[PDB]
Amino acid sequence: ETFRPGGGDMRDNWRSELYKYKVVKIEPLGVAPTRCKR
């Protein structure tokens, strides 16, 4: 197998620094049961 250099698309250059990051949204409202009542 042979390998040759490439590029062109500039979206690759950023990935080499953003491989270890990702984005999430915090959903603080979770329901769950327990033996309480008002």
């Binding site: 590029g7 250059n13 950023w14 990051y21 999430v24």
Partner: protein, 48 residues
């Protein structure tokens, strides 16, 4: 929030064992280059 995977061997895809959370990523200098990656983060242990 933004999650930072903190293990030494990760091909960027799949589950990460040591996940940590951060507010702002590390300094990422926007180096517009081709073929040769320049002034980027160094990998850990074995080359990736």
């Amino acid at each position: 929030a933004i999650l930072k995977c903190k293990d030494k061997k990760f091909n960027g895809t799949g589950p990460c064992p040591s996940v940590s959370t951060v507010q702002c990523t590390h300094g990422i200098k926007p180096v517009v280059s081709t073929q040769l990656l320049l002034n980027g983060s160094l990998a850990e242990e074995e080359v990736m």
